[PDB]
């Protein structure tokens, strides 16, 4: 499948290398840790890379299901 890259490029669903059997949604806090909370460095990953502490990672297998919740006027 494909996954969006928020860490690398700007944000585009581009197939990943051999390993990521799905996508994911990482979270932490930009270098500015704005009031927007954490970030959304989605992408590809073998499996829910979710950590435990902050490293709040997710998953996404659907076609471009890495479109974190942000695309909205607010």
């Amino acid at each position: 499948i494909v996954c969006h890259t928020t860490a690398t490029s700007p944000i585009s669903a581009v197939t990943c290398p051999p390993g990521e059997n799905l996508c994911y949604r990482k979270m932490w806090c930009d270098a500015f840790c704005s009031s927007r909370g954490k970030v959304v460095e989605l992408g590809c990953a073998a499996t829910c890379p979710s950590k435990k502490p902050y490293e709040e990672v997710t998953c996404c297998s659907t076609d471009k299901c890495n479109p974190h919740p942000k695309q909205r006027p607010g």
């Binding site: 979270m27 970030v39 460095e41």
Partner: peptide, 14 residues
């Protein structure tokens, strides 16, 4: 310019 959890555009996100 960022992909936070409140926007996707580098105008609304940052």
């Amino acid at each position: 310019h960022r992909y936070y959890e409140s926007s996707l555009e580098p105008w609304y996100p940052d």
